Write a protein that binds this ligand. Structure first.
Ligand code: NA
Length: 166
């Protein structure tokens, strides 16, 4: 774990991708986290907005919701702030937590969204996101990051996840 990069996961992106594409499937977050834990990663942060603790509704379907609170108790998942004002949901943008933490910790970002609004705000964030984004596919419960996260000539996935190539 000493030579490994910190891992920051877009929890909502991963939960939408897993299972039914239109359902927030929390087992998907668990499966991604487990993929990194089994490789020895000890520094993993999953960000999810706090309002995903609300009860399942027809326009916000969720499965295995209890996973979120459990991962929070394990200090793997962190809720980003959300509240109500005058009956309206006021949500802090979780993408900024994800990018800022990965950037300040010299880590990698697990997400199929490449955050072009934040990239266009700060040139250093654009360069960081473009170099440190880990996209992925699920096949059922199989979490499959690409072995070539930066294409043909980039690092192997093994070396992408390390601080110093081995
Ligand atoms: Na889903």
């Amino acid at each position: 774990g000493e030579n490994l990069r910190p891992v920051v996961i877009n929890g909502s992106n991963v939960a939408m991708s897993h299972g039914n594409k239109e359902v927030f499937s929390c087992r998907g977050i668990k499966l991604a986290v487990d993929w990194f834990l089994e490789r020895g990663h000890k520094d993993i942060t999953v960000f999810v907005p706090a309002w995903r603790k609300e009860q399942s509704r027809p326009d916000a379907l969720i499965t295995d919701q209890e996973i979120l609170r459990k991962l929070e108790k394990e200090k793997i998942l962190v809720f980003t702030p959300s509240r109500r004002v005058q009956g309206r949901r006021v949500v802090c943008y979780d993408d900024r937590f994800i990018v800022k933490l990965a950037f300040e910790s010299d880590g990698i970002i697990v997400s199929n969204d490449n955050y072009r609004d934040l990239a266009n705000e700060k040139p250093e964030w654009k360069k960081f996101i473009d170099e440190r984004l880990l996209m992925y596919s699920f096949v059922n419960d199989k979490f499959m990051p690409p072995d070539d996260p930066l294409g043909r000539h980039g690092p192997s996935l093994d070396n992408f996840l390390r601080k110093k190539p081995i």
